[PDB]
């Protein structure tokens, strides 16, 4: 409750201002404070939470990849010893990234998921849970890499099961969940065939449902379908 003295509505207003100012760390802190008020989040508020943390962890992941690449080049044949600094700094960034992922997972566990009864909210939060375990898996190397991977898979799978029962195949959350689960298969689980099959089946089932949509919904769905197609083009 570092934001404990601020009104819920003011935290949401400030999160929107922080987004406009591209102050994503602030945005995430405001949205964490809003979640900790204990009320469920509306559709727009869930999007604000997700956008905030995706930007924060996205910057950390990009930095981790830069540093990991420098570190791997230093541990090659013919490389001059550079001292412990590259590893130490990569570790610092890695720990910070893990801390953000743990914070998001903690919000989902206390108590966003358990109070989420509608399909749109439950699928949204379970997709988030899969995504943040996936980010943990990207940097994992020790006794728990397998368990982290299984936690991501389990969250995505529960979200997929709900989305297939409760949402049309063009629903943008269902589409983005399938996109990200396919990326999990390709990049984390060493299952490129499963990634390709999921992306193809998702795209084809969405295509067959586009006729039911308004112009605005058609634009929303086809945008994500193009991302599935982009991945299929890279993978095949």
């Amino acid at each position: 409750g570092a934001m404990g003295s601020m009104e819920r509505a003011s935290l949401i207003q400030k999160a929107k201002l922080a987004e406009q100012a591209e102050r994503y760390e602030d945005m995430a802190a405001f949205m964490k404070g809003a979640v900790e008020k204990g009320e469920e989040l509306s559709c727009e508020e869930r999007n604000l939470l997700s956008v905030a943390y995706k930007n924060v962890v996205g910057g950390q992941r990009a930095a981790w990849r830069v540093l990991s690449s420098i570190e791997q080049k230093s541990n090659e044949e013919g490389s001059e010893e550079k001292g412990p600094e590259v590893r130490e700094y990569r570790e610092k960034v890695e720990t910070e990234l893990q801390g953000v992922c743990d914070t998001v997972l903690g919000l989902l566990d206390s108590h966003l998921i358990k109070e989420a009864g509608d399909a749109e909210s439950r699928v949204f939060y379970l997709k988030m849970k899969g995504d943040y375990y996936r980010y943990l898996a990207e940097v994992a190397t020790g006794d728990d890499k397998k368990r982290i991977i299984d936690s991501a898979r389990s969250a995505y799978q529960e979200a997929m099961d709900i989305s297939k029962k409760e949402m049309p195949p063009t629903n943008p959350i269902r589409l983005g969940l399938a996109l990200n689960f396919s990326v999990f298969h390709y990049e984390i689980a060493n299952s490129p065939e499963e990634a390709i099959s999921l992306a193809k089946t998702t795209f084809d089932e969405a295509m067959a449902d586009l006729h039911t949509l308004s112009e605005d919904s058609y634009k929303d769905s086809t945008l994500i379908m193009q991302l599935l197609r982009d991945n299929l083009t890279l993978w095949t």
Partner: peptide
Amino acid sequence: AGSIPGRRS
């Protein structure tokens, strides 16, 4: 391979 960008509300 791209996940949902998801960085703009």
